[model samples]
Structure formats: structure tokens, C-alpha cells
Target chain A: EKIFPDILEAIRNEEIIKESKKIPMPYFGLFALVIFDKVKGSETSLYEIGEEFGKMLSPKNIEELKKIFKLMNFGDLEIDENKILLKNPPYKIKLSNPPYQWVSKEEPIHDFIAGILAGCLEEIFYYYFVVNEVECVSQGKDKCVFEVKE
Target chain B: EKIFPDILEAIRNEEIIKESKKIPMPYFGLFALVIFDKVKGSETSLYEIGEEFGKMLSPKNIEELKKIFKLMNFGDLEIDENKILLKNPPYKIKLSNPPYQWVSKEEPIHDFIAGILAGCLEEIFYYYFVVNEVECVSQGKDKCVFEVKE
Candidate 1:
């Protein structure tokens, strides 16, 4: 998101590899690991931070989120009242399975995304959801699933 | 260095702020901090790792290092048998200075560079010299200094 929209267009259209600024998939994994390692009780703090980002990233509701996610190539997102299912989720494809396999455990690594969802929903719906990844491609599962509850 | 050379030219020429791929100076500070926090004893391991980077980054002696450092805008460097002096060094200018003052760090964050010097000099001279930062702009000094001893 730090990228100017024009640079992003060049990246998509030109010969550039998916790496922006040569920040490879491993750096994402390292960042996630750092949050996990350094932040005590990672979930709460991540969610708090994500809410700040969420307010800034989008203005409308989940419908706008779906539009932006698809527009940004975040892959397909499906959501109902109680659950969200994402296919080919970016973190799973980009970070978890790679020349760098960031996670091998059934334990999910999408907690940050989970928090972001909670962040967006809280602002739009005026309600909080504890969004948690229940199934993850990182867990050797084929799809990504999230459970949400008030 | 992962940036294509042409992109580097665009960065120097166009509206692009000094950030390549939007990687801010803060990320470098974060990386340095992570090493200090996570590595059991950072200096030895950082030196070992930097030697590997040094070999790949430069193929010649201190002369080549001076050229590459200037070409990369790492600021001016001067070297003698027992000491090295660098003016407006990148780490101190980029990471330790304000906009984001990442270091109150007088303990000096240039150890990584110190190690890289050791890494290059060892290959050039065929002997190891302990390289250490003796003074730093981060320490509120005007110039950056390094001491080398066999």
C-alpha cells in the first residue's frame, strides 16, 4: 500500500517480478514472525493496530471491502453472516507455500488478516467480531476459512 | 540491491522519493533491531552473516568497496591501515536521524558495516582484523569512525 498506484500498474504490466522493491515473500514471513515473537499476546495488539489501518484503507462496508479486495487481486472472498471463505488468499499463496515455506503447522498464520477483517467490520457494522482462521492452506488444507462471532 | 539497475536510475531521476519499492528507512531500523533482539549474541552472528553478504556484494578490496559505496550513495569513505572514516554515512543519515529517529543509539548501529569491511578486507588482505565502530554520528558526533586492529 506504500506503493504509488502508478508503480503498482507498472509492476503488473511490465517485466517486474511480483516483488515490489525486492521485498520478497520471506520478508512478509519475517514480519509475521516478528509480531508473533515480540508482541506479547499478539492477537489483541494486532487487532488494535489493524483497526487503525482499516479505517484508513476503506470507507464503506464489507461490500466495499469485497470490491477493493478483488480489485487489488487479493483473490476471491466469500462471506456470509457467520463465516468468511477466501480462495487463493494472498498470505497463504505468497508467504506460507513457497521456495520459503513459512509455516508447516496446521496452526494458521492469517491472524493479521483475521484482525483486519475484525477491524473493518467493527467500523462498518458498529459491532466487533472475533475473526479467527479455522482452516488454512498453511495447515496443509486446500482452502482458507474464517469463523466470526460477536 | 535487488532493485534492477534501471529502476535505480529512475529512482535517482524521477518523482520517486528515496524509497525503493516503498521500503522506508524504518524497515532497516526494524531489521537491525530484530537482529539485536533475536540473536542470542548479535555481533558474532551478524559479522558471520555480513561476511557472506560482503563476498557477494563486492569482489575486490577496499578500493572496490569505496566505489560501490559511493555509487550506491552510501556516502563518502576514507580508509588507512589502522582506521576508516566515513562522511555522511547512510545508516546514520537514513536510520538514526529524524523524520524517524530510529536510534538514540550511541552504542552505534554500524556494526553490520564494520563486519562487512572485515568481510571485504579479509578477502583482499588474506588476514582477519577485528573491525569496530569507535565513534558515530548517532552518538551525536560529527563524523563516523571505525577502528581496525589485528
Candidate 2:
């Protein structure tokens, strides 16, 4: 919510261009990778940082968590009490640009997303939960499946 | 001459990645375009701002202009008293990334580079010179050619 408003303000203030909306995927994807590399030295570090950051957001409850997901543009997420399933994630949208071959892993490559969800939910649920990617769109699965369990 | 020190500072301050050397092509290319688009409103606006910014740098002589190119890592340039030939431009390196389809016009697409050269030379030489891209690597030319005239 806050992020989009600030980005909109930047555009209104002429700090960013209007064409930015057209070529956002590549920029966002590269930004994610580059910032991760800068802040955290490795994949494990990235997940840790991402999770901590998400937890720090303090979403209050599941409804608030869903709002955060929508605000971040990760697409629609299905939630069942403590369990969450994101059918279409932001990374998949980025990969649709026809030239994304940076990290097509045999395992899931959504640690950043997973970390955020796990972190936010763990804090809200008051326990540590296992977040696993059972399927991925990049791996030829129709959608991404993340299993969260206590 | 001027751009390098600031980039070094950004790296040292842990603001950007140290592994930037490993993926220079995409990062640099995207940065240039994204920044231009943000600061300026459109492609034409980018050229205008670029030319103005280049002029503001105000290289005193051909030797200084050559130093600017070298410092910016645009590769070596062959310069006469009035003409500058950049045989291997950075945009060419970007196009070689196997996914760059940004601009492949019969006309040159290196407006920022061209604008910089034109603006700087015109200021130092005391005459408006026509800068044109006669060849482009994206158009299957051996290299990018920028022709300047009085």
C-alpha cells in the first residue's frame, strides 16, 4: 500500500517516467536480484533477510497478510486459516517476458517470496512454519504451490 | 573522468553489489535506459537532457573528451582534431547480450553517447557539429559509427 503510493508520487513528481509502467518486469526482476546480492551475500542470507523484513512489517492478522500480498502485486493468494497458496506469483509474471533464464532452478527459485510469507505468517501465527514450494510455473507446473505448516 | 569515483563510492558504501563486474552488460544497459526514462519524459527528452548534461560536463579539449570515454569504460576512441570515432561502443556490447531488442533502427540509437560527444565537442570547438550514427551493431554493422560535422 505504502510502496505503490510512493511510486505513484515519484511519477507525479517527475522523478520517474510514465513509460516505466511498460518496462517494469525486467527492471523489477533485476532489482530484486541485485538488491538481494547487495544486502545478503548468498541465497540463505537472502531468505533470512527477506523473512525478517516481512516479519518486521507486522501485518496483525491473516486479512492484513492478504492485503500485503495484494499490495505487493504477488497476485491473488488463497488462504485457509494459517495455510496460504499463491496461484500466480510475481516471478512468474516476470518470466513471461521471453528472455528470463537467469535462475531457472530445478528446485523453486522463490525464496524471496517464500521468506516474506513464512516470516509474516510465523509472526502472526505465533510459531515457526515450514514453507515449501511443491510446484512452480517455471518448472512447467501450471501455477506455484507453497505449503506452509507448523 | 567524473563518473567512476562516485560508482566506486557507491560500491564501497555497500549501496550497490560488488559482483557487479560479473553482470555488467545488462545492469549497465538497463540502468542507462531506466535512468534516462525517469529523469526525462521520453526518448527525445532523453537526448535533450543527455546533450545538456554532456555540455555541462564541459571537457576542455579532445584529450579531455578521450579521458572521459576511457574513464566511463566505453572502450578506446580514435579522435582527430574535429572528429571522434568509437569503434566499439557500450551499446554494441549491450546488444550482444542475445536479448537486446530495444532499438535496431537504420538511424543510430546511441543518443546518450552521441549527445554527449556532440555537446562536449561543440562547446570546446566553438561550432555546432552534426552528430549522426551511420552504422549500428544491432543493424549488423561491425560497430557503431558516429559522424560529426561543422
Q: Who wins the TM-score comparison?
A: 1
The whole-model C-alpha lDDT of candidate 2 against the native structure comes to 0.46
Off by over 4 Å in 1: A1-150, B1-22, B35-44, B71-73, B80-102
CA lDDT of every candidate: 0.45, 0.46
- Model 1 chain A is weakest, by summed lDDT over 10 consecutive residues, at A92-101
Q: lDDT by residue for model 2 over B23-90, one digit each (tens)? A: 22222243333333332322333345446545655678877766655444444555655323443222
At residue B144, candidate 1 shows an lDDT of 62
The ten-residue window of minimal lDDT in model 2 chain A covers A91-100
Candidate 2 stretches greater than 4 Å from native: A1-23, A36-44, A82-105, B1-150
* TM-score of chain A, all candidates: 0.56, 0.61
- The numbered model that scores best in lDDT is 2
Worst 10 residues of 2 chain B by lDDT: B91-100
